[PDB]
Amino acid sequence: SEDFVVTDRGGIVENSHRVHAAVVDAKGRLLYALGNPTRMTLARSAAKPAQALAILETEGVAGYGFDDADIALMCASHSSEDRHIARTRAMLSKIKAEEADLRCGGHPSLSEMVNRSWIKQDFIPTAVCSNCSGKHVGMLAGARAIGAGTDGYHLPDHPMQGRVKRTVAELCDLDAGDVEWGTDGCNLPTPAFPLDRLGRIYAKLASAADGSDAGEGQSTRCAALAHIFRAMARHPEMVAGEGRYCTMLMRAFDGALVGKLGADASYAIGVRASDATRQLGTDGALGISVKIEDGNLEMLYAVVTELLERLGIGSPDVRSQLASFHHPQRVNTMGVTTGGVSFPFKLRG
Amino acid sequence: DPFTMTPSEDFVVTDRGGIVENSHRVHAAVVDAKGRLLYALGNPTRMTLARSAAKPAQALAILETEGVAGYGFDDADIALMCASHSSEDRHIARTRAMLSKIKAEEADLRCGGHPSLSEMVNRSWIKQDFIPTAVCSNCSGKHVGMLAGARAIGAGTDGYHLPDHPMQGRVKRTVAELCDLDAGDVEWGTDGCNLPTPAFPLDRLGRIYAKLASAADGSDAGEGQSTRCAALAHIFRAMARHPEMVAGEGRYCTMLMRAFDGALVGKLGADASYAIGVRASDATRQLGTDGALGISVKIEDGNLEMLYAVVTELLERLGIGSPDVRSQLASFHHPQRVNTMGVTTGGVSFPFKLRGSNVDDPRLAAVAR
Ligand SMILES: [Cl-]
Ligand SMILES: [Cl-]
Ligand SMILES: [Zn+2]
Ligand SMILES: [Zn+2]
């Protein structure tokens, strides 16, 4: 099916971007789709909650005293704000590691205002500034916890990566051979699986949170999932930072969902049971996964907000906090409005 | 499967370890001097905002404005009228020099400042807290041309940028005439520099650039020319001789035009349009035309990195230049996919297929898409 977000200058088509989306229930049954909802998709940072699970399920990790903020950073593509780097350093301290132990590299900040601040001060970002720094410290913590040694914690043949590989396939309900692996910008293995399975991970996150809240019997696995949901909802500034879609989405909704960006314009949302989900004809939590085929971030945020509006997730009041993402500014160097965005797609049911 | 390939399948693709990351739809037209279509990718008649790729057509409207010759604009100045420049100091200085030649001030410009198209210029600006103003606009030189036009005909500099102004009437007609289109087949929006900007089928953008390179061939041959073909040959020559004014250091357009040493001109449009005018050569004759050639490209989704990759791939598929001319552009053709720890994690490939002249079954439709 033929689903585009379209940008226009004076009603004249500028760019068009192909949209894929899956809305799934708690068991990962497909409720709603755009484009191809099973598109083989690199989840990139959208997978970090599942990598966080592998760290949290590593024997001895509880001993380090990681708090909800720390777990939030494990789940983060953060903007590398001073407060992100400070929490990375404090997490290194809790496991008696140093920055030299990190196998991720510096890069320009995911926030242009942070990056401009760095440029002004001639600052060259190092390992500790990685958007992925919290995940790498988690991996160091897991490595040391089982006495596997911290050297090579990032390599596919290290037991930490064997744990991550198994945990991703389990959460997706996939055989090992159905998950493909490349290398991320931060130099860890990174999975690809059908986009609907990314929605399933986040439906299980939200369903865990629901199960915890309703005093139900839970595996250690569901209890860990609910703790990850809780940490992301509680400290959304650690997951992203000031002005970032994921932070403003999670603050607007105040514990009702979690949202996570993946690089090259993936998005995942886990939504707790609500009048909205019941309305959509499911009894449980749901998951939403989205890919912009061509990788455009600005179009991703526009489409995710349009999707929430079409699914009736939130009130119009809540969703209005995301107005500048939904209909991004199309204004020239002289303050004249030159065009906008349109959403000529229909959700299939 | 390889025998049922279609324009809808004309993609440039990025991979991580062989896994598809992003894919981008490509549209391209290759046309002769009269604008006959020789080769295509995707939909070569896609209605497309030319944006800055139309700047040579706006430069022609300025140069054919009676009295403009009086101001003493040189080749460097005309090159800046055709520019999307990086706002380097030499670009700002040249703009101020052009403002003096017409006795106008920075205050008469109706374009606004913006971040430099060059990361290196931007870094320098960030460092010194510099806020770009009108005179730094990538489009500054086009705007001074328009002012120059406005003064020469006695129209008033006030509103020179508005559709009702006779300078914008001249642009409107010149663009339709160069495209060989009725007015009603060219649509108009507003550009980032706050001028009218046209949209026409992608193949007519290639036709404009074919006419530029054709005029250059007629001039070099010492053929008698219309005022129009003489002016087009002057624009070609200005762009080819002063490619640093058209863009700047490190910019695809400058490096492409230096590499080819007068054999073609090339211009970026915002949101990933490109236009090339190729002078008659062995290459163009090999491609089955006895004159100059035009190429126009659009990435459907607007990705600029994929545009430079695709344009370089397409020059190589058309046989334009030596491998050794083209290899100044290797870093644009096959962009680096190196992670934060120096490890290559993937790259770009070009699963698209030139059509127009291998011969496929007459029953395989090639639907513009
Ligand atoms: Cl003509
Ligand atoms: Cl990378
Ligand atoms: Zn990472
Ligand atoms: Zn302009």
Author numbering:
A (entry chain BBB): 4 to 352
B (entry chain AAA): -3 to 353, 356 to 367
Which text from the study accompanies this structure?
All the crystal structures reveal the presence of a zinc ion in the active site area. The zinc ion was found near helix H9 and the loop connecting strands B5–B6, with a tetrahedral coordination sphere formed by Cys135, Lys138, Cys189 and a water molecule (w1). The distance between the water molecule w1 and Zn2+ is in the range ~1.89–2.05 Å and the position of this water is the same in all structures. The position of Cys189 is nearly identical in all the structures and is additionally held in place by an H-bond to the side chain of His139.
